[PDB]
């Protein structure tokens, strides 16, 4: 809760190379994130009553958030959120095909990774401008694939995040300008499976 | 949860006379939430893995429902709680005037009651077309006077309805036709604080 | 223009008996259509710029009004546009089928008047809350049968409007609660047809 | 009309160094720009009736369109008009401040150049995500400065667009990665206003 803190990257900013940049890596931790931090911290100073409160439960209510600081919450809020997510989601040495009970699910649902990978790559290519795809469980044992527009996080409608791909364009744009497609093929390299599997069990 | 039931009203059609007549107390309980709970029912009928889940659940989770009955339960599922929880507010023999926990929030946090009701009434009048003025509790202890369109619950954005009034031209055409600020001056004399209480203490 | 007017029903209010009550058409025009004209004038009247617009373009450009009339507009503006259509298609002694070149598109497009009558129904029953249903042309020569919310008028999407049917309740509760359905059979016995051609030749 | 074509810039890639780099000027025409066509052409392609409509009217009427392509021509036929304007509006030897009718209507409803160049750049950084900062004209002789988001034109609203600034990530990164401000610094160094002129009286 408040304040808000910058989590470490965790590992060094060339260690996805060449799949993902070690510029684009420095800039998008210190730079994009860093100032979703901030500017979240700025947005609840000014209401101590909010300060006890996880990143979570302010998304899950902004309807209840005073009017002057609900877009910043959604978008900061947001913003931290999904790229602290991101962050471990890349960190290196983890499985590279779904594993566990996160993958039992995923076969029983979708049919298998091969047609999983195939819709995840479908909700990020048709997300029009700035915004993420995402794999989600909800309450009742369902896994879906979708996307939403800039920082606004799943967790907002009541879904469970597992695995976000950030299509921003600052997340590709320094290595593969327009060819969102071919970062797409690259991040399949870095997702780390074991990750994703601990956030399904805990949620 | 499923099969929901129509509530009982729990009085007499002419316990509320001349404050709202009994004919449209009838037909709002018997026709229209009548209308609203077999609707519900056709919509989840087809899908046995919702059928242990309360109202409230489905309405925190319309973005997990399959595509093809989001809007039948957000309308239906909303038509349903917030008439059951409109039947309980009118029980006749209670306070008049908040009571109890209830009483000390709304001094503390409008200035008492006339303020309240001031600003309840600002919100019915001001909702144009269908739609319900509410007092709602937020998970951070404070109260919000807000209004909703059509038979959307202020649940579906994490609130917690405390008094609902109905807008909707059925709740009040039949004896004061256009005249809904008669008919909010009227629900005053109605309204059961004991049964809002409740509401307030129980979450 | 400003100061708008509340045009004349032009018939007495029993004509469309017993198809549609007379204190209903009386209430429907003196009391609802009048408010929305007197609203429509107060909004306006602050600002003289506006004074020499109609309302369908005040309605076409919403975006670009004073940020503190554009509701005020919308729903009044919105009403006024909608029941004065409305009191027109009403007039008595018109064709009770399509006629003329209105009908060769609706036999062209639709198949016929009864393909039309029952896409019709389906959108004025479709509309929760409070509508209005319509057959709107666009300017590529297509008709459309859609429904809009509470006062919106097909006009600030670009359709021209032929034909729209009131679906608020205080269009049909006195004399039919909640039976929609019953209002909506009684309507297709009072729909002008000749003035329906009128406008869309006018379109 | 269709097939639309992707216009020439009518100047080198590198006529505004060191303000906006070469490389970015190219993949933004040739490659953003370029798809946007593209795929306009291709939803288009589908409907020969829609063949002799200029992309404005498109965009004026998206509601009428077949809902197949709707999104289609929004995104893209936005993307191919919006793109138009910032080529034109960046034309090498223009004058760096307003001139003529539309520096007088500058000065009388924004108090000065200064004023104006305040108002865009905060709705330029106010932008969150992807979209375009504007200067546009209402059919009443106003002037307004507001964002849009993703490929949104503002002839969808009604307004004429006067100055448009793309503040898509695209737009920037190369150069001044997340420095969208440092960018819009230089946007003022490259802004031709007798071209802005041409667009304000043509109106
Ligand atoms: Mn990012
Ligand atoms: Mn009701
Ligand atoms: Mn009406
Ligand atoms: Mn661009």
Do not use: C
């Amino acid at each position: 809760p408040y304040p808000f803190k910058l989590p470490d990257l965790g590992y060094p900013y060339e260690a996805l190379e060449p799949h993902i940049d070690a510029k684009t890596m420095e800039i998008h931790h210190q730079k994009h994130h860093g100032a979703y931090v901030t500017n979240l911290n700025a947005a609840l100073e000014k209401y101590p009553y909010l300060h006890g409160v996880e990143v979570e439960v302010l998304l899950r209510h902004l309807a209840a958030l005073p009017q002057d600081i609900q877009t910043a919450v959604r978008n900061n809020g947001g913003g931290h959120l999904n790229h602290s997510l991101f962050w471990r989601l890349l960190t290196p040495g983890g499985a590279k095909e779904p594993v566990g009970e996160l993958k039992k699910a995923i076969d029983e649902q979708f049919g298998g990774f091969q047609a999983l990978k195939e819709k995840l790559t479908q909700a990020a290519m048709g997300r029009f401008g700035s915004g993420w795809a995402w794999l989600v469980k909800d309450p009742f044992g369902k896994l879906h694939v979708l996307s939403t527009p800039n920082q606004d996080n799943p967790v907002m409608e009541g879904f469970t995040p597992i695995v976000g791909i950030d299509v921003w364009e600052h997340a590709y744009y320094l290595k593969y300008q327009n060819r969102r497609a071919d970062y797409l093929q690259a991040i399949w390299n870095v997702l780390n499976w074991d990750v994703a599997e601990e956030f399904f069990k805990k949620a």
